[PDB]
Amino acid sequence: AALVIDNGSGMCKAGFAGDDAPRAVFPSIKDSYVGDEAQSKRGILTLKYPIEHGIVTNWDDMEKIWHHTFYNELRVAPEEHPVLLTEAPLNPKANREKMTQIMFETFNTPAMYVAIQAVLSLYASGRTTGIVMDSGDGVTHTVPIYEGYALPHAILRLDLAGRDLTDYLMKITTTAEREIVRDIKEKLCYVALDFEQEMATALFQPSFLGMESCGIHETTFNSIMKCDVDIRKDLYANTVLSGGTTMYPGIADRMQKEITALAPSTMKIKIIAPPERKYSVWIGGSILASLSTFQQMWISKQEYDESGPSIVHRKCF
Amino acid sequence: ALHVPKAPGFAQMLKEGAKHFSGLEEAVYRNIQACKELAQTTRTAYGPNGMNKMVINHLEKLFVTNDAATILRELEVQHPAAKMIVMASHMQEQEVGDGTNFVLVFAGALLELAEELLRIGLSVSEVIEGYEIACRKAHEILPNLVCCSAKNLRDIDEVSSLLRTSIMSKQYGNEVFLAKLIAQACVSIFPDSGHFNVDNIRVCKILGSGISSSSVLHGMVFKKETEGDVTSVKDAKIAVYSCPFDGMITETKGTVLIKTAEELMNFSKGEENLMDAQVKAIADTGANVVVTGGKVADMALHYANKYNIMLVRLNSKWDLRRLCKTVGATALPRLTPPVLEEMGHCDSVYLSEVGDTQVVVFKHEKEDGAISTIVLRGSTDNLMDDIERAVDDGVNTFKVLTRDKRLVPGGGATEIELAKQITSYGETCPGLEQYAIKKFAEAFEAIPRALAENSGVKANEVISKLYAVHQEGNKNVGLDIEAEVPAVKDMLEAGILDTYLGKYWAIKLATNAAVTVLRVDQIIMAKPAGGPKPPSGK
Amino acid sequence: MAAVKTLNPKAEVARAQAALAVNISAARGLQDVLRTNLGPKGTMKMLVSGAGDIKLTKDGNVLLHEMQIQHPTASLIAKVATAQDDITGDGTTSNVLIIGELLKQADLYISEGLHPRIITEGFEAAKEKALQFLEEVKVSREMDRETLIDVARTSLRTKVHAELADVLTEAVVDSILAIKKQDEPIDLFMIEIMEMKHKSETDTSLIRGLVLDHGARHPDMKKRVEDAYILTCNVSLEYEKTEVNSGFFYKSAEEREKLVKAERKFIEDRVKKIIELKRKVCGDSDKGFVVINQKGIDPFSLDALSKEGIVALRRAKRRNMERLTLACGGVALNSFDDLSPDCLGHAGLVYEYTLGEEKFTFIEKCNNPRSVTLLIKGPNKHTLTQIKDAVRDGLRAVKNAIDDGCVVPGAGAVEVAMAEALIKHKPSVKGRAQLGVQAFADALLIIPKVLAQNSGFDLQETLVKIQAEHSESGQLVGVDLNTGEPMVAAEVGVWDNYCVKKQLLHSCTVIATNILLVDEIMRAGMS
Amino acid sequence: MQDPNADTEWNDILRKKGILPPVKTYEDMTLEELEDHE
Amino acid sequence: LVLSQNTKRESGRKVQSGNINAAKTIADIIRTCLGPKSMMKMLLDPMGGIVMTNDGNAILREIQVQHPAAKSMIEISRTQDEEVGDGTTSVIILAGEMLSVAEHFLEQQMHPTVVISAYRKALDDMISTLKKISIPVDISDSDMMLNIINSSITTKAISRWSSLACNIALDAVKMVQFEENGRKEIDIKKYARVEKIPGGIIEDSCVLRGVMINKDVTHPRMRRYIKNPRIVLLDSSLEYKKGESQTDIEITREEDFTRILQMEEEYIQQLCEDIIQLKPDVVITEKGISDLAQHYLMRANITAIRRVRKTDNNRIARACGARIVSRPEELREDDVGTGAGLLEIKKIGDEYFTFITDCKDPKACTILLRGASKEILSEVERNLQDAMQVCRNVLLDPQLVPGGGASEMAVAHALTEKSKAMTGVEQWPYRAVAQALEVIPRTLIQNCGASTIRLLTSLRAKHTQENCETWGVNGETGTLVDMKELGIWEPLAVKLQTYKTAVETAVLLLRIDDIVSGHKKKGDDQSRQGGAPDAGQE
Ligand SMILES: Nc1ncnc2c1ncn2[C@@H]1O[C@H](COP(=O)(O)OP(=O)(O)O)[C@@H](O)[C@H]1O
Ligand SMILES: Nc1ncnc2c1ncn2[C@@H]1O[C@H](COP(=O)(O)OP(=O)(O)O)[C@@H](O)[C@H]1O
Ligand SMILES: Nc1ncnc2c1ncn2[C@@H]1O[C@H](COP(=O)(O)OP(=O)(O)O)[C@@H](O)[C@H]1O
Ligand SMILES: [Mg+2]
Ligand SMILES: [Mg+2]
Ligand SMILES: [Mg+2]
């Protein structure tokens, strides 16, 4: 089979291909028996999670985690199973070379592949083309995808995530009380089609927060407009949202309306954002690792030995 | 007793949606039938009388053309043997640029005749032997059929007469105009060195004035506007920068650390004074035109307007490289003033409005340069795309003539002479190879047959006439398109000629494709994937 | 995927090698199932219908029709076995085994690139030589009770337990040796077979008379008659309405009463004729009178006959007419127009037996009955069915041994000897059909092989011992199922039917040849 | 669905994950019919 | 809309190539079942049955198709089987080859009417050539007729028992030969019944000098063996049945019920007395016989058999020389049947069978087949039908023609030699139809496992000499032989009908260019057939 380790700036969410749920959610997942079956895990339990804002800070930590998400929470061997790792969109090449050196050299994995988290999210929803708006805890990303691959040239990156969202709400300071504001953020926070008619009975606009770059709907629109005019229909009509940040307000229709406004009066835009399987990236990875085109895309161990960081970078510089 | 079970072994162990075909009946004949369907799909587009096709691809995009390779690309060919013939046709397009439809027609014909021979009782191995030996004879023969040669590629009348044939099959009605344009463009390029690069012929498609309004431009055209207030320049001193037209910033991270009210008061004035100094150094080198591959800053644009410099912004890097080749400049990664060698020059750089489109034109007056543009006017984008394909055919023919200046007669003359000579060779070869040699010979008849069928005349009358006249000794005789009845005429004296290399490679690739398709005996198709397509091809 | 699938897309097709593989695999599967049926050391299979009914069987034909199979080759072989059973009664398991083994031995050489046509030519040559060797080794014997007993033993010991086989032997041989007329083909219909479900299975007996599965429906009728005149009739003694829709019309209750008395005059007259015959033939109560009617008898007629002391059974079987006229010795009548005492038979005993809810009528002590009955007694329905199958096999066996006065040694002896003769004959065959001959020989050799396999011995060692003994001595030898050693089948009383062996050779060769020459199985009659 | 449901493995994986939902007898013969054969 | 939603319509070269490909597919289904080295096919009926055969019509009859061209080819096979009873594979293969060589000419711009005219000319000349190369035969030569029948069964599974099957078919046909009132007739369909009892051995199968039915005596007192039976046949029931009218009776008197029942008994007595007046030994009825009638017939010492089929009764009439009657009062000695030499009723297996099997001059017979199983005997019956139909075709037209493809090659050569004088445009289709006849030898050679190219070349060359019209192929050795040395001689009628059917179907399928499908039947009112008036007709 193929181990599908979904880092997803969350937990490890590792398992096997074919499983509808991961089997190794390490971060925040016996005793009185004999052996080292708690101490070895007791060490990892208090180890800081390397990925911050969707980027790996401490690699030794991450490697120790993976090693403990292979030998302890899966009780398997990576020397015979291909691995599908996940990376955040627009992830530096250096991080890719590091993780590929870890897998092929340390864990001696026969073959591996690194997929974009938004692409796997789109896969778990069953589609292969569309523009994914991924807004988590630290970053916001718009990933246009056509034929199942994240077009590396139309990835617009703005920053208005859970933190930036709860910020203005705090404005309306202490950790516990800004987390009361964040509890309200976690709970119902219905998106407003029009803030006028929503405040009458009491990210889209940078000025609201205090930024001066662009809204998320503007971001999606321009990411669609930096693609093929023929696939434009598919991008506009298959916009898939993901991320607990964007889920909390449940923003579908405000986006839809202002994106329709921006787009020509031709393409009909439909946004599918009701899943919330809480393992979308994992299921997308499992689907990919189950396919045979994954064997096609395999960066093999021999390929790695022959090319190195160049094979991880897929040439084409 | 109401169901036949799968036989023990491979029939049972095979996966669910997989298919297995084996033998002449399940595999060879089905492959030949698929290739025949392909050849039939593209046959009616062969030649000047070939009709256009309106292919709509999966993205609902429309292609109106009689260019075989374009139709094949935009068709979703799913049968693997047909896929192989298309792979051969695309290799022909890549190597030569013209002759893809010949490859298809000839491969389909060879496969049909191979099916015939297998039915009479020959083995695929013997068919392959005969086809290969006959291809070798065809290659031995073709050099002797060469009638003309270019003898000069710096001229424009000879080059126009030479490109006319390649740009006649496509765009039959207007072939003197387009051949003139493509000859003008090709000869402005093609330096004293024998190397000719086809990417240096640029084609700008602007809409609205009929194809006769097309023109050649010794220079470059960009469907852009100017960033500043200046729009025209008569003695361009272009300075090209791969960097933006802004102040250089740090690669790590930059923070303006203020600790005194004075630093705060002076920072912005210092920034603008720095920008003024930079652009004034550029202007003082004499540059009146600046072309940046990156963005433009508001202050830098301000000062470029102040010092009367025309600013142009080219988003693409290939556009920047081609502009550098055009003007004789060097893309500087810094905003430093250019040295006398790093600067480029143009007899004119101006903003114009061709039709609805606004364009920036870098126009030389000399009848040369490193890059030339063909501005195609036309009432339809599809029409202009078809004319661009015709331009590509003419340019690839010019390159083939730079590589090999030899020419063979067209209009089916070379094909008929090849058929005759290879039949005469097969009549001498004893053994079971003679059948396959004679079928390989008769396969050439498919070309004048398709030309006749498309002209609207009886292919049998035409082929009989051609055989009779080529028996009398005339190897340069081919069929006449200008005849309501079956007729024939001297292809040479008419000026209808093909490229030795074109025919060479077309025959080689078509024969290899047919022979490859025949060598298949078992096919084991897998269940169709839902995979996100090939990873490398993106 | 082929020619047929382009015209009928929902078509199933097996071509050349695939078709051969399909057919041979199915044949080998049937053989694997039936290998255990062969011989007395075989095992009984239990077969449960979709209703839950139980069958205990060792019979190849029964097992075939009862196995749950849907294969075309299995259908072909089932029909071949059904023909074997319909004509000979035995030889079905051996039929299936020889078919499967011919197919296997031919696949041995066809996998080596040999064409099946040449194997079939070798099959035909070997058939000729084997039929010759069979006619040569057949033992023409005057069919005495001892010989017939040994034959029926060889069959019944394969089909049932040893004690029950030793009983059914005497029953079957006596039954046939009784219903048999000198040089006149044996009508097995003249052996009724009645099963009773009350006592042990070793109580199965031969009644030298008849057993009807019904009795008298009038209670006052005697339940036992000693010296009985039997009147076998096919005359309605119940009320029959007119064909032409008559109906009665009366103007008074007295006229209605007269019409009620009159409407039965027609049947009262036939009852009176019977009663007058009874009085004229037995003027006292010393003898008895038994009427057996193929048609009905209404309660009025039953009363009229009981009053005179007649035991009347009604609605007997159309075969019992002939069985009673051949056992007892009367004449079966469709009318009592001119009936005489010569129309009557005699039975030295007639009585009735009640078993639960049913009644039986025994007619015994006939003089020289050319018809008898086998009373299959047993405690279970499946025991009775098993014994019925066994007695069918045994009756067919004795009939065939009498009809074909020759008899062939058993225990695979004839097969061993025919294999040796075929192998010695091989050089006289021209070309590679010698391989077909070899295949025929090793196929014939499956009977001793399976017999050894079922007695619990090593097939190869036993077979080499047996072939060695037959080549050094020439004595027709087969398997001793208790020692695994060679034994002379003719000396130990293991006999087979020459007709059965010939039918095996012919039908097996023919069906195997036709199967090997199949190159396409095709189901395309859909839609 | 995003793609046309056909004989492909992608739809099958989606289905496995949970997306893209997937004369008889003498019993009937009359008096006349019974006589017919007998 | 204009036409229904379910109405599809195809037109043009697509339809033509599709029909030709469907025909070619039907031909490829049964191409391997041709010749003495053919292989069997095990087809599965939708009734759970099985059909093992190498008979073209059996195969194509158990297949069902949806393409109308394939339907036309199956109808070809049916027509050939009904007319001549052989050639059901040769006809299909020839039609397929002709449609192939017509596909060749329709790919070019030749109109189907031209191909059709050429086909009709070629058919005329095929007929002329067959009649010219044929030979006559003396039908009184039993050995000659047996060899003729062997040449027809050598291809079928019963070839193993060839003397037996040949004698069976010959005896059967010679007996069922019947002339009455100046009209010769054979009628193998109604007489010469084939009755197959599974079991026994095929070598004991025989044709009876009489008939056989599956019936027993009505009463076990009847005789089952009679050595000179006088036989009476009846269409009427010997029972007392109701009248046509409403014959309700009304009873008031006491004696009337009993008298009516006695009247019934006396009517039965009177019928049986009308019968006994003729003093028969056997009485055979198509309807029932009452038990009282059995009593009276038995008193007369008459054996009676009831519920016999009308066809069986007609065969018994033809065999024993009797006339069926429906009113015993109208019975005559001219209606009584003498000619039978033995009536027996014997138990075959577990079934009683009535034989009338010592007849003198029986104009009907029963072929008693014995064998391994029902399927094998069904195949034997089909083969015997082939043999008998061939024997009949011979006795009608005693002209003989050489087989092994010799006739096909002779005709091909004659047509090729006549084509030279044509000098028109139909010479190509003509010479194609001439060279399409060689698919019979070709297929034969293929089924042997020999080299088609070399052997067919040697044969085509042999048939160009003067006295070589009889040279053909040996289907069991893969060589060339003279047919007067091999012995394979077909009936001229068979070959004529084969060629005619093939050419006519080629014509039928070439005239089609358009298919309209899906439209409804428009007929539901009890399947309207013809009922209507006309214009006078007086
Ligand atoms: N004026 C003409 N008369 C006859 N044949 C011509 C003429 N112009 C071009 N051809 C023939 O048309 C064929 C090429 O046409 P085209 O459709 O472009 O096929 P390809 O794509 O293989 O070049 C060549 O055989 C060429 O000789
Ligand atoms: N006591 C015995 N010892 C050795 N062989 C026997 C004995 N009884 C029967 N056989 C052989 O076993 C074979 C199979 O017996 P049976 O199963 O009744 O025949 P079938 O296989 O036709 O049902 C027969 O060929 C018979 O000769
Ligand atoms: N022994 C033989 N050798 C060569 N050809 C034969 C031989 N026997 C028959 N033929 C020819 O081969 C063909 C066989 O016909 P067959 O397979 O029975 O199909 P059909 O007669 O129904 O067309 C006929 O043309 C016959 O003349
Ligand atoms: Mg061209
Ligand atoms: Mg037995
Ligand atoms: Mg025939």
- Amino acid letter for position C190: M
For chain A, list the strands marked E by DSSP: 3-5, 51-52, 55-56, 83-87, 111-116, 130-135, 140-146, 149-150, 156-158, 239-242, 271-272, 299-300
Q: Which residue has the tokens 């998400």?
A: A69
Q: Is B286 left (phi over 0), alpha (psi -120 to 50) or beta?
A: left
Report the separation in Å between the CA atom of C389 and the middle of ligand 5, taken as the mean of its atom positions: 10
Specify the DSSP class assigned to residue A106: I
3-state helix, strand, coil in chain E (%, to 5): 45, 15, 35
For C471-527, list the strands marked E by DSSP: 477-479, 486-488, 495-496, 518-523
- Spatial neighbors of C409 by CB under 8 A, at least 6 apart, are C137, C139, C476, C478, C488, C489, C490, C494, C495, C496
Q: Which residues of C are marked as active site?
A: 59, 92-93, 393
Specify the long-range contacts of residues C180-189, CB closer than 8 Å, at least 24 apart: C180/C402, C181/C370, C185/C403, C185/E346, C185/E347, C186/C399, C186/C402, C186/C403, C187/E347, C188/C395, C188/C396, C188/C399, C188/E347, C188/E350, C189/C319, C189/C322, C189/E347
How far apart, in Å, are the Cα atoms of B61 and each of B120, B205, B392, E483?
A: 45, 18, 21, 67
Report the residue of chain A nearest B56, measured CA to CA: A230
Q: Following CA atoms E402, E406, E408, E414 in sequence, which dihedral angle do they give, to the nearest 10 degrees?
A: -100
Residue B479: Cβ within 10 Å count = 29
What is the C-alpha end-to-end distance of chain C, expressed in Å?
19
3-class DSSP state for residue C416?
Answer: helix
Asked whether the beta carbons of E216 and C189 are under 8 A apart, the reply is no
Q: Which residue has the tokens 């010296």?
A: C227
Q: Which residue has the tokens 């007489």?
A: E191
Asked whether the beta carbons of B420 and B94 are under 8 A apart, the reply is no
**Phi, psi (5° rounding) for residue E515?**
-130, 125
What is the spatial distance between Cα B317 and Cα E4, in angstroms, rounded to a whole number? 59
What is the spatial distance between Cα B184 and Cα B373, in angstroms, rounded to a whole number? 10
Angle at A31 between CA A25 and CA A33, to 5 degrees: 125
Report the separation in Å between the CA atom of B181 and the middle of ligand 1, taken as the mean of its atom positions: 20
Residue B499, H or E segment: strand B497-499
Strand arrangement, sheet containing B357-363: B219-222, B357-363, B348-354, B232-233
Neighbour-count burial of E1, counting CB atoms closer than 10 A to its CB (0-12 exposed, 13-18 middle, 19+ buried): exposed
Contact B435 E453 (CB under 8 A): yes
What is the spatial distance between Cα B393 and Cα B380, in angstroms, rounded to a whole number? 20
How far apart, in Å, are the Cα atoms of B139 and each of B414, B474, B504, B509, C513?
A: 12, 20, 7, 12, 56
Neighbour-count burial of E145, counting CB atoms closer than 10 A to its CB (0-12 exposed, 13-18 middle, 19+ buried): buried
Q: Answer positive or negative: Cα dihedral of C64, C66, C67, C73.
A: positive
Q: Which residue has the tokens 């590929």?
A: A100
What is the spatial distance between Cα A193 and Cα A204, in angstroms, rounded to a whole number? 11
DSSP C321-354: HHHHHHHT----BS--TT--GGG-EEESEEEEEE
Tell me which residue has its CA closest to atom 16 in ligand 1. Answer: B47
* Residue C39 among known ligand-binding residues: yes
Buried b / exposed e over C353-362, threshold 16 CB at 10 Å, is eeeeeebbbb
How far apart, in Å, are the Cα atoms of E247 and each of A191, C241, E55, E377?
A: 96, 15, 57, 51
Neighbour-count burial of C432, counting CB atoms closer than 10 A to its CB (0-12 exposed, 13-18 middle, 19+ buried): middle
* Closest to B41 (Cα-Cα) out of B122, B90, B108, B92: B108
Instruction: Report the Cα C18 to chain-centroid distance in Å.
Output: 38
How far apart, in Å, are the Cα atoms of E292 and each of C76, C236, C296, C336?
A: 46, 11, 16, 10
- Spatial neighbors of E248 by CB under 8 A, at least 6 apart, are C244, C245, C246, C247
Report the separation in Å between the CA atom of E404 and the middle of ligand 3, taken as the mean of its atom positions: 6
What is the C-alpha end-to-end distance of chain B, expressed in Å?
52
Instruction: Report the Cα B250 to chain-centroid distance in Å.
Output: 43
Q: How far is E453 from chain B, CA to nearest CA, in Å?
A: 5
Report the separation in Å between the CA atom of C154 and the middle of ligand 2, taken as the mean of its atom positions: 7
- The question of whether E89 is a catalytic residue gets the answer yes
Q: One of E285, E386, E470, E498 is an active-site residue; which one?
A: E386
* Closest to C39 (Cα-Cα) out of C503, C480, C490: C480
What is the spatial distance between Cα B86 and Cα B103, in angstroms, rounded to a whole number? 9
Alpha carbons within 13 A on the beta-carbon side of E124: 9
- Amino acid letter for position B492: L
What is the spatial distance between Cα E338 and Cα E321, in angstroms, rounded to a whole number? 6
Asked whether the beta carbons of C277 and C231 are under 8 A apart, the reply is yes
* B and A interact (at least 3 Cβ pairs within 8 A): yes
| Tokens of residue A316, six digits | 């084409």
Ligand 1: does its nearest atom lie under 6 Å from the Cβ of B97? no
What is the spatial distance between Cα B468 and Cα B479, in angstroms, rounded to a whole number? 12
Q: Which residue has the tokens 């030709």?
A: E20
Question: Looking at beta carbons, which residues of chain C come within 8 Å of B2?
Answer: 70, 523
- Spatial neighbors of E10 by CB under 8 A, at least 6 apart, are E18, E514, E515, E517
Q: Please, after which residues is chain C broken with C–N above 2.5 Å?
A: none
* Residue E490 among known ligand-binding residues: yes
What is the spatial distance between Cα C448 and Cα C101, in angstroms, rounded to a whole number? 13
- Amino acid letter for position B193: S
Neighbour-count burial of C70, counting CB atoms closer than 10 A to its CB (0-12 exposed, 13-18 middle, 19+ buried): exposed
What is the β-pairing status of strands C210-212 and C345-347?
A: unpaired
What is the spatial distance between Cα A103 and Cα A66, in angstroms, rounded to a whole number? 9
What is the spatial distance between Cα B229 and Cα A299, in angstroms, rounded to a whole number? 53
What is the spatial distance between Cα A86 and Cα A150, in angstroms, rounded to a whole number? 13
In sequence order, which ranges of C179-264 are alpha helices (DSSP H)? 253-262
Nearest-atom index, ligand 1, CA of B99: 22
Neighbour-count burial of E349, counting CB atoms closer than 10 A to its CB (0-12 exposed, 13-18 middle, 19+ buried): middle
Report the residue of chain D nearest B531, measured CA to CA: D10
Report the separation in Å between the CA atom of B175 and the middle of ligand 4, taken as the mean of its atom positions: 13
What technique determined this structure? cryo-EM
What is the spatial distance between Cα E446 and Cα E428, in angstroms, rounded to a whole number? 27
Nearest-atom index, ligand 3, CA of E490: 27
Asked whether the beta carbons of B311 and B227 are under 8 A apart, the reply is yes
Instruction: Report the Cα E238 to chain-centroid distance in Å.
Output: 36
The residue of B15, B78, B527, B533 whose CB has the most chain D CBs within 10 angstroms, and thus the best one to mutate to test that interface, is: B527
* Closest to B373 (Cα-Cα) out of B199, B238, B121: B199
Neighbour-count burial of B89, counting CB atoms closer than 10 A to its CB (0-12 exposed, 13-18 middle, 19+ buried): buried
What is the spatial distance between Cα B66 and Cα B87, in angstroms, rounded to a whole number? 18
Q: Answer positive or negative: Cα dihedral of E417, E418, E421, E423.
A: negative
Angle at B22 between CA B20 and CA B24, to 5 degrees: 145
In sequence order, which ranges of C179-332 are alpha helices (DSSP H)? 253-262, 265-281, 299-307, 318-327
* Residue E38 among known ligand-binding residues: no
What is the spatial distance between Cα B136 and Cα B131, in angstroms, rounded to a whole number? 9
* Closest to C523 (Cα-Cα) out of E43, A298, B262: E43
DSSP B131-193: HHHHHHHHHHHHHHH--EE---SS-SHHHHHHHHHHHHHSS-SS-HHHHHHHHHHHHHSS-SS
Report the residue of chain E nearest D38, measured CA to CA: E307
| Tokens of residue C348, six digits | 């030295």
Q: Which of A228, A231, A296 sits opposite B531 (nearest CB)?
A: A296
Asked whether the beta carbons of E398 and E208 are under 8 A apart, the reply is no
Ligand 2: does its nearest atom lie under 6 Å from the Cβ of C158? yes
Contact E288 D37 (CB under 8 A): no
List, in sequence order, every residue forming a beta bridge with B19; answer none if it has no partner.
B525
What is the spatial distance between Cα B102 and Cα A2, in angstroms, rounded to a whole number? 47
3-class DSSP state for residue B241?
Answer: strand
What is the spatial distance between Cα C40 and Cα C25, in angstroms, rounded to a whole number? 27
How far apart, in Å, are the Cα atoms of B70 and each of B64, B86, B446?
A: 9, 11, 21
Q: Which of B94, B165, B490, B500 gets mutated to test ligand 1 (max ligand atoms within 8 A of its CB)?
A: B165
Asked whether the beta carbons of B31 and B520 are under 8 A apart, the reply is yes
- Amino acid letter for position E282: V
Q: Please, after which residues is chain B broken with C–N above 2.5 Å?
A: none
Angle at E305 between CA E303 and CA E306, to 5 degrees: 145
* Closest to C108 (Cα-Cα) out of C94, C122, C95: C122
Asked whether the beta carbons of B243 and B334 are under 8 A apart, the reply is yes
Q: What is the CA radius of gyration of chain E?
A: 29
- Amino acid letter for position C482: N
What is the spatial distance between Cα C16 and Cα C292, in angstroms, rounded to a whole number? 63
Neighbour-count burial of E282, counting CB atoms closer than 10 A to its CB (0-12 exposed, 13-18 middle, 19+ buried): buried
List, in sequence order, every residue forming a beta bridge with A239; answer none if it has no partner.
A271
Contact E39 C188 (CB under 8 A): no
Segment 172-231 of chain E within 8 Å of chain C by CB:
198-202, 219-221
Question: Looking at beta carbons, which residues of chain D come within 8 Å of A18?
Answer: 16
Residue B406: Cβ within 10 Å count = 21
Multiple choice CATH, B219-403, 3.40.50.2300, 3.30.365.10, 3.50.7.10, 3.40.50.10860:
3.50.7.10
| Tokens of residue E169, six digits | 């078919």
Helices B381-403, B176-188: inter-axial angle, 10-degree rounding: 60
What is the spatial distance between Cα C405 and Cα C400, in angstroms, rounded to a whole number? 8
Ligand closest to CA E501: 3
What is the spatial distance between Cα A258 and Cα A204, in angstroms, rounded to a whole number? 9
What is the β-pairing status of strands A111-116 and A299-300?
A: antiparallel
List, in sequence order, every residue forming a beta bridge with B240; answer none if it has no partner.
B291
* Closest to C278 (Cα-Cα) out of C349, C228, C219: C228
Ligand 1: does its nearest atom lie under 6 Å from the Cβ of B451? yes
How far apart, in Å, are the Cα atoms of E488 and each of A257, E87, E153, E451, E461?
A: 87, 14, 10, 21, 21
